[PDB]
Amino acid sequence: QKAVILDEQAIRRALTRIAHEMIERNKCILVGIKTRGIYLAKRLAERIEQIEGNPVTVGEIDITLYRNDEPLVKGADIPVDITDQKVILVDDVLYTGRTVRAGMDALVDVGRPSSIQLAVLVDRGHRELPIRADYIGKNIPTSKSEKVMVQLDEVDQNDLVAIYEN
Amino acid sequence: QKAVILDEQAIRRALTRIAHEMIERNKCILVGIKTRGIYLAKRLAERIEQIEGNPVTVGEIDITLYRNDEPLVKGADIPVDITDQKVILVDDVLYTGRTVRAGMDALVDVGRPSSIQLAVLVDRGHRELPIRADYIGKNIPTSKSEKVMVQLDEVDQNDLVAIYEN
Ligand SMILES: [Sm+3]
Ligand SMILES: [Sm+3]
Ligand SMILES: [Sm+3]
Ligand SMILES: [Sm+3]
């Protein structure tokens, strides 16, 4: 048993809305966290380029969770200097915030960004840290037992966001 | 030229409201950051004990800012284990969020808290990180040039929160 919250079209509209919001708020480098966060950052960069006309750099931080979910940073690949620049971390599902914390720490170690923002496709609540997203595709109230999973063509061969019961 | 936003009585009411909110949300260890954040944590612990009847532990993280304000952690003194516990960082004025980030990092290094919340006397906006407070005494919209300063009896011999122009 699962419930589809966002289909492919809903994901597309959310990503397009986020791209527009980013453009409006910032007149920037996108850095994905988690496997799907990285694919989402690449989609957002493509949307921003199609809207604004100029290239958007995409980097990634490679992070893995472990059960205090202590996520470890394996490595980071950001192809340009982030010092004095605005970086927007891109996440698929904002939950406890522990992966985002790890990503922020990785960024402040590789450079001195002027600011770090956070864009997420879904925010399911239940933060365990004082972390909030600046851009959100869809807020989804969830119980602590439910799981939220994003499927993307690049990894799962389909685009969908679904909620599952314990 | 300065404008008083909160007088002693307003600070007292804010701290009392925050204590009540903490009690309601959490049925916990308070850790102050910044000189005034530490004094505020001690006041909150006293209010919670007077409301609930049980002692509240107070710790502190010693952090200093430097102009990417890179705040450095000099040391931390938390008198009890924070592993598997809820810790609430206490800050005087939430601004860029860079001091809070440093405090969270210090905490996850000394233990494995189940969660970290953030209580602030004032939130003046202008975050440079995806950080949000869970408890706020007063929100104060400010321009980027204005400064917000909290005075406490323990440090400044008077209780007041004031805004100053560039
Ligand atoms: Sm539909
Ligand atoms: Sm597709
Ligand atoms: Sm008055
Ligand atoms: Sm007083």
Count up the domains in chain A and report the number: 1
User: Could you tell me if residue A142 is left (phi over 0), alpha (psi between -120 and 50 degrees) or otherwise beta?
Assistant: beta
Q: Kindly compute the dihedral angle of the four CA atoms of residues A126, A127, A131, A134, in this order, to the nearest 10 degrees.
A: -20
Contact A104 B101 (CB under 8 A): yes
CATH code of B32's domain: 3.40.50.2020
Three-state DSSP string of B84-131: CCEEEEEEEEECCCHHHHHHHHHHHHHCCCCEEEEEEEEECCCCCCCE
State how far the Cα of A125 lies from the Cα of A141, in Å rounded to an integer.
6
E strands of chain A, at which residues? 2-6, 29-33, 57-64, 72-77, 86-94, 115-123, 135-139, 147-151, 160-164
State how far the Cα of B48 lies from the Cα of B155, in Å rounded to an integer.
22
Residue A122: which of A95, A88, A157 has the closest Cα? A95
State how far the Cα of A75 lies from the Cα of A60, in Å rounded to an integer.
9
Kindly state the tokens that stand for B126.
């202008």
Q: Helix (H, G, I), strand (E, B), or coil: what is residue B52? A: helix
DSSP A131: B
Is the dihedral angle over the CA atoms A19, A22, A27, A30 positive or is it negative?
Answer: negative
Using a CB-CB distance cutoff of 8 angstroms, which residues of chain B are in contact with residue A115?
A: 127-129
State how far the Cα of A58 lies from the Cα of A37, in Å rounded to an integer.
11
Give the Å distances, CA to CA, from B75 to B71, B92, B107, B109, B116. Answer: 12, 19, 11, 12, 18
State how far the Cα of B150 lies from the Cα of A32, in Å rounded to an integer.
38
Question: Could you tell me the resolution of this structure in angstroms?
Answer: 1.6
B13 labeled binding residue: no
Q: Are B117 and B89 in contact (CB under 8 A)?
A: yes
Is the dihedral angle over the CA atoms A50, A76, A151, A130 positive or is it negative?
Answer: negative
Q: Are A121 and A40 in contact (CB under 8 A)?
A: yes
A–B CB contacts, 8 A cutoff, strictly below: 59
Using a CB-CB distance cutoff of 8 angstroms, which residues of chain A are in contact with residue B105?
A: 105
The strand pairing partners of B136, in sequence order, are B120
Contact A104 B100 (CB under 8 A): no
Q: Are B82 and B111 in contact (CB under 8 A)?
A: yes
Chain B residue with CA closest to A135: the answer is B130
Q: Which domain holds residue A88?
A: 1-166
